[PDB]
Design a protein around this ligand. Structure first.
Ligand code: 91W
Ligand code: 91W
Lengths: 10, 238, 238, 10
């Protein structure tokens, strides 16, 4: 998933 | 001497690190406060989460990183984050007290504090000796940030697709570093190899920490104290 | 008059609530501190997480609950937790200040504070009016705790398997309550129906909160501020 | 999954 990671990488 | 591309890379990495490392440590008050079972875990969990956000911010400004695929960026970050935290934390570490000082004595962490977040001397003693050895290298700002970027860009992480490109970026950085030490660091003849040794050490530290973390995060009563971001990044669910 | 079974149930529920509600609010200092985008979200997330732990502790001591299946216990908790938090929070609420006072002014939450955690007046105004209406009922301790237990045991929650048993437990509790009000609450003639009305209100509040929470938790930059427990309980992943 | 919930329910 990695929702937060994806988000933070813009 | 160095080239303007190499120099621009150095300038970029330094600016990146300055943008993502707060020497005031003024954000620390926002963490769940320290306490002295596993009393220090909420505080150190918040500290590490905050720090992961910082490492991500730094990586996004490494030349070439945000041109990698989201998959590769995630893989590089999940593999390297703990190592970059260990590296970047040297800046708050003190040979005098043999521990990390981030402002007041509230945010002063010795071995025992980290013991109160679930870890053992099998990790903490090597970690401390790594900190001391690294601090005694007395790296320039430029060298510190180059080493972080290099650590981040190792292509021999699990999950990595584009080995060749990542290794290209990493190589460019290593040339930048070796040249920098050649031209700019007096008596740094032996330095580059020592720094490379420190990267290896980081691999061992990563290994040990991952085992102890696996132990911790397998117990719901402790993992519930972790943060979403920490759980994602140190998670195995890639 | 009341029976010794009904009385034992009351005694159990009161003891349970006393064991899981700390009137000193001394644990609040352990939360990420309040701040006045969405500055109050870390603090209120920790508050709610702490409170969920409390509700679970309380439910485990409801007569018959921990005889239900783990599935039913989870379903009842995931459906009702937000309602029990809203109910139990009345104990810190004040008609004077129209807000919740948990010790110092640091832990004093008005509508604006909760606005700074992502919610709107569409939830907060009904929530406040519910708090005030409920506070004006001036429930006895016994009635408050019976109402929480009753709310918890509604069998018309989604995910619930054993409707009949859950409804049996709930009915026993309702008889306990109605009798208690009959025999022990002077001028409480109209009380039981009012309390039942408050349960309905809780359903509406639950509805609204679930929408706004769905909104919040869909944005990673906000959900990362939530806790693991909050994410599990308010999550839809049942 | 509900790891934490299961745990807390003993
Ligand atoms: C994280 C930073 C600082 C200190 C880092 C420390 C000192 C306290 C203990 C830490 C956080 C170690 C322990 C092992 C952390 C790593 C993950 C975490 C959990 C999740 C508990 O395993 O424990 C890693 C670096 C250790 C302070 C400052 O230099 C900022 C820097 O980013
Ligand atoms: C939770 C409790 C107390 C206060 C509860 C309050 C006042 C502050 C705002 C709260 C926490 C509401 C908001 C809407 C919460 C519910 C979930 C949470 C998030 C996750 C942000 O949606 O927001 C629910 C009850 C509201 C204080 C004390 O009585 C203990 C009690 O358990």
């Amino acid at each position: 998933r990695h929702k937060i990671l994806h988000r933070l990488l813009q | 001497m160095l080239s303007d591309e190499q120099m621009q890379i150095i300038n970029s990495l330094v600016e990146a690190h300055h943008k993502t490392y707060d020497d005031s440590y003024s954000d620390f008050v926002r963490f769940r406060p320290p306490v002295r079972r596993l009393s220090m875990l909420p505080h150190l969990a918040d500290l590490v989460s905050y720090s992961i956000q910082k490492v991500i911010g730094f990586a996004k400004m490494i030349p070439g990183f945000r041109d990698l695929t989201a998959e590769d960026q995630i893989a590089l970050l999940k593999s390297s984050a703990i190592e970059i935290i260990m590296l970047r934390s040297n800046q708050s570490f003190s040979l005098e007290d043999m521990s990390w000082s981030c402002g007041g004595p509230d945010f002063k962490y010795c071995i025992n504090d980290v013991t109160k977040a679930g870890h053992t001397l099998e990790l903490l003693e090597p970690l401390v000796k790594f900190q001391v050895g690294l601090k005694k290298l007395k790296l320039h700002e430029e060298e510190h940030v180059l080493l972080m970027a290099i650590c981040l860009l190792s292509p021999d992480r699990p999950g990595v697709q584009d080995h060749v490109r990542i290794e290209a970026l990493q190589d460019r950085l290593c040339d930048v570093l070796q040249a920098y030490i050649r031209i700019q660091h007096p008596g740094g003849r032996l330095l580059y190899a020592k720094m490379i040794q420190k990267l290896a050490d980081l691999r061992s530290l990563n290994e040990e920490h991952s085992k102890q973390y696996r132990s911790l995060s397998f117990q719901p009563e402790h993992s519930m104290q972790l943060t979403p971001l920490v759980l994602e990044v140190f998670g195995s669910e890639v």
